[PDB]
Amino acid sequence: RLKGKVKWFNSEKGFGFIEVEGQDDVFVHFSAIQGEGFKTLEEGQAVSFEIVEGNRGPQAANVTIEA
């Protein structure tokens, strides 16, 4: 499980990027957001997640918020 910081998020649309020191930025869709309530993110927020890669490339998965 990786940790990182929400680079930026479009709370209307559902996407944004997660930045991690070491790797490139990871795309995060709202659907990746675990937890309760309305799935969204804000910049600076610390997250833990994994990277799932299909035929469309990597993307965040299993995003839990907090740190």
Side-chain angles (χ1 to χ4, degrees):
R1 184 145 185 90
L2 305 147
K3 312 220 198 82
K5 290 159 194 177
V6 179
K7 186 182 264 193
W8 68 261
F9 197 85
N10 187 142
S11 288
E12 300 77 32
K13 291 296 195 172
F15 68 95
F17 279 72
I18 284 158
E19 66 182 7
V20 20
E21 282 291 319
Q23 295 168 342
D24 311 327
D25 293 348
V26 179
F27 171 78
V28 64
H29 185 241
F30 74 84
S31 57
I33 303 179
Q34 301 312 270
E36 286 302 330
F38 194 74
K39 294 177 192 176
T40 191
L41 301 184
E42 310 163 44
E43 70 173 1
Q45 261 179 334
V47 291
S48 46
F49 59 98
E50 299 132 43
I51 296 155
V52 192
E53 167 167 350
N55 61 15
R56 192 152 191 194
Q59 213 198 329
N62 206 187
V63 171
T64 63
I65 315 185
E66 238 316 61

